[PDB]
Design a protein around this ligand. Structure first.
Ligand SMILES: *[C@@H](C)[C@H]1/C(=C/c2[nH]c(/C=C3N=C(/C=C4\NC(=O)C(CC)=C4C)C(C)=C\3CCC(=O)O)c(CCC(=O)O)c2C)NC(=O)[C@@H]1C
Ligand SMILES: *[C@@H](C)[C@H]1/C(=C/c2[nH]c(/C=C3N=C(/C=C4\NC(=O)C(CC)=C4C)C(C)=C\3CCC(=O)O)c(CCC(=O)O)c2C)NC(=O)[C@@H]1C
Ligand SMILES: *[C@@H](C)[C@H]1/C(=C/c2[nH]c(/C=C3N=C(/C=C4\NC(=O)C(CC)=C4C)C(C)=C\3CCC(=O)O)c(CCC(=O)O)c2C)NC(=O)[C@@H]1C
Ligand SMILES: *[C@H](C)[C@H]1/C(=C/c2[nH]c(/C=C3N=C(/C=C4\NC(=O)C(CC)=C4C)C(C)=C\3CCC(=O)O)c(CCC(=O)O)c2C)NC(=O)[C@@H]1C
Ligand SMILES: *[C@H](C)[C@H]1/C(=C/c2[nH]c(/C=C3N=C(/C=C4\NC(=O)C(CC)=C4C)C(C)=C\3CCC(=O)O)c(CCC(=O)O)c2C)NC(=O)[C@@H]1C
Ligand SMILES: *[C@H](C)[C@H]1/C(=C/c2[nH]c(/C=C3N=C(/C=C4\NC(=O)C(CC)=C4C)C(C)=C\3CCC(=O)O)c(CCC(=O)O)c2C)NC(=O)[C@@H]1C
Ligand SMILES: *[C@H](C)[C@H]1/C(=C/c2[nH]c(/C=C3N=C(/C=C4\NC(=O)C(CC)=C4C)C(C)=C\3CCC(=O)O)c(CCC(=O)O)c2C)NC(=O)[C@@H]1C
Ligand SMILES: *[C@H](C)[C@H]1/C(=C/c2[nH]c(/C=C3N=C(/C=C4\NC(=O)C(CC)=C4C)C(C)=C\3CCC(=O)O)c(CCC(=O)O)c2C)NC(=O)[C@@H]1C
Ligand SMILES: *[C@H](C)[C@H]1/C(=C/c2[nH]c(/C=C3N=C(/C=C4\NC(=O)C(CC)=C4C)C(C)=C\3CCC(=O)O)c(CCC(=O)O)c2C)NC(=O)[C@@H]1C
Ligand SMILES: *[C@H](C)[C@H]1/C(=C/c2[nH]c(/C=C3N=C(/C=C4\NC(=O)C(CC)=C4C)C(C)=C\3CCC(=O)O)c(CCC(=O)O)c2C)NC(=O)[C@@H]1C
Lengths: 67, 54, 160, 161, 198, 161, 160, 161, 161, 160, 161
């Protein structure tokens, strides 16, 4: 469905969480295309830094057959 | 010996704010100028260069 | 209302009102005489602002009044002027309240869906309220023109 | 929610007309009361912990409900009680700034009866607590601002009763 | 005071908020190397989303691809929960037999852990359901700010016990205290406005 | 939900026999309905906004409901009513394709009356809106498809009222 | 293609394709000869359809090409006829695909945002594609008129 | 994000002393500029759609970008480009309010150039669109406010390049 | 209503068998307690005016409800509150003589909370009046005989809360 | 209807219907076709029967149409003919239903309160529907005139 | 139910104080208005039926509510509506005698809203019928007595709205 793969570093700026937090601090995740704009807006609002982003799934510049 | 005979219509409903009947007279006083009928037939137009290109 | 907006923000932050919000309420509650004077100016000039702005809108965009247009007949033009009176009343309400929340709650949420269902060009409605703003600023004092033009500005921005 | 000026605006809106002279007179009445409302809100926001402290000391402490097994027992429930009276005083300050008791039955009284019924909360003990807040705030801020605060606090009491 | 007899002893033993707030487990997928813990988090996600174990309601596990991506750690628990929401099983058991308001109720129960906050939230989610279906609805309510502030990207959602706003805690209590398919009525149909605008 | 074909399948299965002659001629009736239902669905999905557009124009527009004071007043409530009528038209089309009102009383009518009473939505005005959809669909799709569409729409009316 | 729609449904429910959609794909690959026939007939008669449908659109809505509208001037009606030709090519793509997925993924999602930014009367574009449906049904065979007009009608429903 | 005032605070805090005279002068400069920033914000919020409409008309319409074979062909990609330019205008207005481009660095530029390179989006065409936005808003709000508005827009361009 | 002995009979009849040995043991326990129940009932019936007199004196006089405007004001309402406490004491004596708390929710607590909520009767004041009743009764009939009175007056408190 | 009056009587008396009463709904459903003939001939000749009835009332009672009268005006005679046609509708409903129940449920309960609010003579409207009876006996066949004129006798006796 | 005098008495009773000067000059205002109220009572009691007659003549005759399908159609519903207007006029006369709206609160408006909603009674037409009663009695009894009758009938209208 032409999804993205990203690496982002999201720190915590308001709470000192006493359990393990690398799995939601520095992560690599598969994000769908129609959800990626909202996900990126969410990360940039939460203060994360998008280290890397690429279109690991699908072909860029496709007109039809993107489903 | 005069007699008071009423009418088939009831009393007229009092015109309120949201009803556009109170703006009909002001629309008439505007009398907005319509546009002339455009005399284009679109068979003589050719879609390869009359579409702009910049 | 500015009091309603500050109460909503304080409730969202789960706190009492800040001194900045509180003396903004103080400044509004002292300076409301000018805003109610603006509201009386708009209420007195209600018919002429709508009339002149309707004439200017139909001069600028005659294809909402042409055959095939959304507002063709004299009754359709009366509905156009009715919508203009609606939005002038909302601008008066916003001037009185000091905040755009009554305007949002009455005539800006779902306006795109409403005018999509009615077939009405919402960019031409934005032009209509723009000419209403122009006429009101023409017949209003300059500081009062800016104060009313803030709410006219918000209505233009949310339509367009 | 709705304050006094939005109430005037909606009362004009339901009949469709603009704001006439009586609407402007009600607006000027609210503008006259705004000074008192602002100063009372500042005083209550400054002293808000002391009011609920004095109210709980006056009406709740050394009783059967704070003796063990009661609802005021088990310190989590005591902190939730202090939080509840803080909520009541804060939303009463909101309604006092507003001039209309719409926030009280929108964001407080909505489901509060069956909340307290599901949690086993003594209703008239809470009503006595808000009345304790009422004379504490009346002694704090004065007779007229205390009167307005009393109006919204016993509106909360009547909704909770 | 008094003698404190056994009926009221049993009454006041369970008095305030029920102990299920503390007597639960929060499933945080700490690491994907522990495949047993991955499987535990996956079954907990199934139980949270569908209120029960989905063994008598599958042919085979249709989410096995999602389990594979979660075990390989190129998706997170948030994307696993979103994949469970945007699935045929969730719409078969929670969107097909229910009206759209009930779909809003069950969706915020399974995903946000609490009742809908207000009529503004009900209107927004009803608009999303009317326009784009339920997949965009699940995506919006999972990618919203509240889900990330409460659960985050590594935590299976759980039943929440809120304090604010009004009626949210009792509507959450009445939405979670009834078991699956107990009744078809609406716990929170809509919030009655104290002031009708216009 | 279920349609007529799964209805007769489930009615055969609950008593535990195969398909008998009553199931045979019921299936023959549904297949004979068939083409007419799918053509009505095609033309409704074609001009989907048209029925709701001039239905609101015929029934709801220029009245006290859409004037100030009424419930069609304000643009949010107008868009909500357009959304409700799109819901009703879509689900009536779904029941028309099904041949049974299971999707009607299982996706629409449960909770609708009490949520409309909570929101203050006028039941009679919604009924007249549904009648307007019935008339415009009868004008657009024909006679037989129009009257079975009218059966489903006034089933919605009978459930709501 | 409907094989792509069936592959989406099968992969989403995580199972092999149902025999129902198997023989629907069988019906599609039998009827693909008639689909290809309708495709090249519309390809051959694209220009007469777009010109006659634009003419009937201009008789229905003369405000479109009047001064003040979106399409005033030979330039701005040439781009409208080009939009019509774009939609006709999209309908041919959808007919030759068997589904409506290429039509919606080329020209129907985001089109309200596009034509709102351009100020275009989307209901008049819907009436334009209605006139295209009428001209194509008149020019084309009656048995295939239903199957092509269904896809035209999908464009009407998604656009209006 | 940060503003001019918070940037002054952080620049004082990293070397750990109080606000000196230069920090006071910078705060005075921002407080003087705030009037013009507010009025430019109001004008841009009025003409948000008009600016992006005129900019995309004068820069990218009837070109190879919007022709078939271009990246802005199809309504999906047109709506995506329109949304991109609208968010660029809104966030540049935010930076014009704040007086500091940290919101551009933290909420517009991280993960955006690499996303555009992943999708094949033309960097030069997006830059020219932002320049068209710059010229339209400079003609529409004035040269004085348009100076720093174009400063933040060229900051977006330099980050994207 | 029901007592301990008919509770034994009904528990036998729900499961459908005769009276087994544990049923006979429960009956003999009731027959052992019956002398104490009869003696306590005679003492309470003899002194029943004094219990309610001292309880109202130690819990209800000189309070906000007794000051004018309150519920205890207006001698009609005062004597009605006295009659209510007489009813509570008499039905608690009935329950103590019976051995089961079924008469309270069959003849006292049925609709009583709804009655007091519609009537504006202070719930916690009634509860503390019941607490004064059970304290005076336990002081009068002793600790062991007052234990059952404590059971049933606290059952009234739990039902009314 | 006769069935609904008998079943209300049986429901009040806490019993099944008496076999005489079942025999009489049996008689009603065997003889019902003549009642349908009465209904269709009254529906066919509604305008002439009400013409003759109104004209002969205006001959017999000139005080009704005299100056000062309630039915003096042209308007007032028109709404008198409205009431005439209403009672004709009630008689057709009654002869269809086989009982006096629709007449009493629609146009007799509270009719004295209505007509004393309006100031109209109830004896005069009873005379009107009596004249409808006599012209109906003149116009319609003799055997069915017994049932139709009998229901007319009911309404004139209940109204006068 | 309470009139103005006993409303003053009960308010001072809840206040717990004697009659101050506000109570005395409100009582003097009622004693001044009493002759006017008695004369208006005599006029309305003389013309009780004719006021309703001309009001229903000038409000809802020859209209859609009197048409078939309307709710004033059939003699039963018409006479019920006339009795409703008689109730409104008589209770407005009672409230005009009392100088208080408590009789309208407890004996008229209690349950009337949901009664008319269950019956389908048109609220707006009922309100304008009460308005017609107001105009007829204002033309009949005088300006000031008509003004008190009008404000009580408008209280009925606001309670019914
Ligand atoms: C000396 C040890 C310290 C101290 C104590 C102190 N506490 C109070 C008042 C109260 N303490 C409680 C405590 C609890 N409630 C619970 O549920 C639990 C856990 C089971 C506890 C520990 C409560 C409820 C009160 C309120 C009064 C009451 O008894 O209900 C006081 C009295 C304060 C007053 O003025 O009334 C004091 C003095 N104070 C100190 O300075 C020492 C640090
Ligand atoms: C001397 C005059 C006599 C006397 C009086 C006395 N009364 C009380 C106690 C109370 N009296 C009342 C009365 C009223 N409640 C009402 O609602 C009304 C109508 C307005 C009345 C008159 C009440 C409520 C009390 C209770 C206590 C209170 O203060 O409210 C007492 C006190 C008894 C005690 O032990 O507390 C006394 C002494 N007693 C006499 O011997 C004289 C004959
Ligand atoms: C001529 C013989 C008669 C005549 C009649 C007369 N009628 C009216 C006005 C009304 N008549 C009705 C009656 C009905 N309403 C119903 O729903 C039914 C069937 C169940 C009936 C029969 C009503 C309601 C009116 C009021 C207005 C209306 O027409 O709806 C008038 C006019 C009175 C006036 O003051 O306007 C007259 C004169 N006059 C007579 O003497 C004979 C009784
Ligand atoms: C302390 C020795 C030095 C240092 C520390 C520092 N750490 C953070 C923040 C984070 N630290 C971690 C590391 C872990 N989290 C885990 O769960 C585990 C394994 C159990 C490890 C090793 C993470 C993930 C963060 C980010 C999340 C968070 O902030 O809690 C900071 C804050 C950075 C910031 O400003 O956001 C700091 C300063 N820095 C020093 O100078 C000390 C020498
Ligand atoms: C005039 C400048 C433009 C325009 C106007 C036009 N409007 C309508 C019809 C309606 N407008 C509304 C709007 C509102 N309802 C509300 O509650 C509010 C906020 C207070 C608003 C703004 C409604 C409800 C209607 C429907 C009719 C009614 O009065 O209820 C029309 C008529 C369309 C029709 O088909 O009848 C027209 C023509 N059209 C233009 O071209 C100008 C851009
Ligand atoms: C305190 C003096 C009295 C009392 C109350 C009590 N309340 C709770 C807990 C809750 N109260 C609420 C109610 C509200 N929700 C709202 O939105 C508002 C207005 C803003 C209110 C007032 C809710 C939802 C809770 C549960 C939330 C929580 O986390 O507790 C408790 C605690 C119960 C517990 O088990 O924690 C208590 C004890 N009980 C008394 O006896 C006093 C009279
Ligand atoms: C339109 C015919 C009339 C009407 C409509 C109206 N509706 C709302 C709001 C809502 N309607 C619903 C109902 C549904 N829930 C479901 O699950 C379904 C079927 C799938 C339906 C139809 C709901 C939940 C809402 C609230 C959410 C929303 O607003 O979209 C309103 C708004 C009321 C308000 O202000 O909250 C209105 C006005 N009312 C009329 O007057 C028209 C005649
Ligand atoms: C004609 C039926 C109506 C009409 C058309 C009109 N369109 C434009 C401008 C544009 N149209 C498009 C369309 C598409 N691009 C795509 O990729 C697709 C899907 C394949 C479509 C349908 C575009 C991109 C434009 C922008 C110009 C460009 O191509 O560069 C205009 C011009 C408006 C302007 O220049 O501002 C017009 C007039 N308008 C009507 O009123 C008719 C109803
Ligand atoms: C428009 C100036 C040019 C351009 C645009 C274009 N954008 C997309 C899609 C996306 N753009 C973004 C970028 C952003 N993320 C952010 O957080 C912000 C600022 C708030 C921006 C601007 C993202 C994330 C996407 C993908 C998500 C989505 O599309 O919803 C496309 C589509 C690419 C495709 O293959 O579909 C296009 C075409 N390209 C041009 O040619 C214009 C010159
Ligand atoms: C007349 C203005 C409109 C109207 C009237 C109408 N009313 C009824 C029936 C009832 N009216 C009442 C009202 C009251 N009863 C009381 O005791 C009091 C206060 C003392 C009031 C205000 C009630 C209870 C009824 C129901 C009992 C009954 O059957 O009479 C009807 C009849 C409804 C029916 O189904 O028969 C009508 C028609 N409706 C209109 O259209 C007029 C505009």
């Amino acid at each position: 469905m032409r999804m993205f793969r990203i690496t982002a570093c999201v720190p915590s700026q308001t709470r000192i969480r006493t359990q393990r937090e690398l799995q939601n601090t520095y992560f690599t995740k598969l994000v769908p295309y129609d959800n990626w704009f909202r996900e990126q807006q969410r990360i940039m609002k939460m203060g994360g830094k998008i280290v890397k982003v690429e279109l690991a799934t699908g072909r860029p510049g496709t007109n039809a057959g993107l489903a | 010996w005069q007699n008071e005979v009423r009418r088939f219509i009831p009393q007229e409903k009092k015109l309120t704010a949201g009803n556009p009947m109170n703006f009909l007279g002001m629309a008439r006083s505007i009398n907005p100028a319509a546009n002339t009928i455009p005399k284009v037939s679109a068979q003589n137009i050719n879609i390869e260069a009359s579409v702009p290109r910049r | 209302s500015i009091v309603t907006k500050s109460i909503v923000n304080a409730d969202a932050e789960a706190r009492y009102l800040s001194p900045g919000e509180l003396d903004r309420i103080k400044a509004f509650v002292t300076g409301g005489a000018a805003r109610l004077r603006i509201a009386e100016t708009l209420t007195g000039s209600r018919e002429t602002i709508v009339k002149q702005a309707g004439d200017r809108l139909f001069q600028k965009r005659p294809d909402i009044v042409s055959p095939g247009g959304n507002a063709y007949g004299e009754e359709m033009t009366a509905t156009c002027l009715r919508d203009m009176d609606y939005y002038l009343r909302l601008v008066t309400y916003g001037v009185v309240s000091g905040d755009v929340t009554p305007i949002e709650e009455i005539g800006l949420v779902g306006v795109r869906e409403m005018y999509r269902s009615l077939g009405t060009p919402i960019e031409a409605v934005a032009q209509s309220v723009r000419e209403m703003k122009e006429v009101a600023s023409g017949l209003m004092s300059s500081d009062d023109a800016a104060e009313a033009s803030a709410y006219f500005d918000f209505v233009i921005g949310k339509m367009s | 929610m709705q304050d006094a000026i939005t109430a005037v605006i909606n009362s004009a809106d339901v009949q469709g007309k603009y704001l006439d002279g009586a609407a402007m007179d009600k607006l000027k009445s609210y503008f006259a009361s705004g000074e008192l409302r602002v100063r009372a809100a500042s005083v209550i926001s400054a002293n808000a912990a002391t009011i609920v402290k004095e109210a709980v000391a006056k009406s709740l402490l050394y009783s059967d409900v704070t003796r063990p097994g009661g609802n005021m027992y088990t310190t989590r429930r005591y902190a939730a009680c202090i939080r509840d009276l803080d909520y009541y005083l804060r939303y009463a300050t909101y309604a006092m700034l507003a001039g209309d008791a719409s926030i009280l039955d929108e964001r407080v009284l909505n489901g509060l009866k069956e909340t307290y019924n599901s949690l086993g909360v003594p209703i008239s003990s809470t009503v006595q607590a808000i009345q304790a807040i009422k004379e504490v705030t009346a002694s704090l801020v004065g007779a007229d601002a205390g009167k307005e605060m009393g109006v919204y606090l016993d509106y909360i009491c009547s909704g909770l009763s | 005071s008094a003698i404190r007899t056994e009926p009221e002893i049993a009454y006041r033993s369970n008095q305030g908020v029920t102990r299920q707030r503390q007597q639960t487990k929060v499933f945080k997928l700490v690491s994907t190397y522990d495949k047993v813990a991955v499987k535990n988090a996956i079954r907990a996600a199934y139980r949270q989303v569908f209120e029960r174990d989905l063994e008598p309601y599958i042919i085979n596990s249709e989410f096995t691809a999602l389990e594979s991506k979660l075990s390989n750690n190129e998706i997170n628990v948030k994307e696993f929960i979103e994949g469970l929401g945007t699935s045929e099983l969730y719409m078969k058991e929670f969107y097909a037999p229910y009206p759209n308001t009930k779909v809003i109720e069950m969706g915020t129960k399974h995903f946000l852990g609490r009742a809908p906050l207000n009529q503004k939230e009900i209107q927004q989610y009803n608009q999303i359901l009317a326009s784009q279906g339920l997949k965009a609805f699940i995506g919006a309510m999972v990618n919203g700010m509240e889900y990330l502030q409460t659960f985050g990207e590594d935590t299976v959602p759980y039943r929440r016990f809120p304090t604010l706003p009004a009626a949210n805690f009792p509507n959450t209590e009445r939405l979670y205290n009834k078991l699956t398919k107990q009744d078809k009525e609406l716990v929170v149909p809509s919030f009655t406005p104290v002031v009708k605008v216009g």
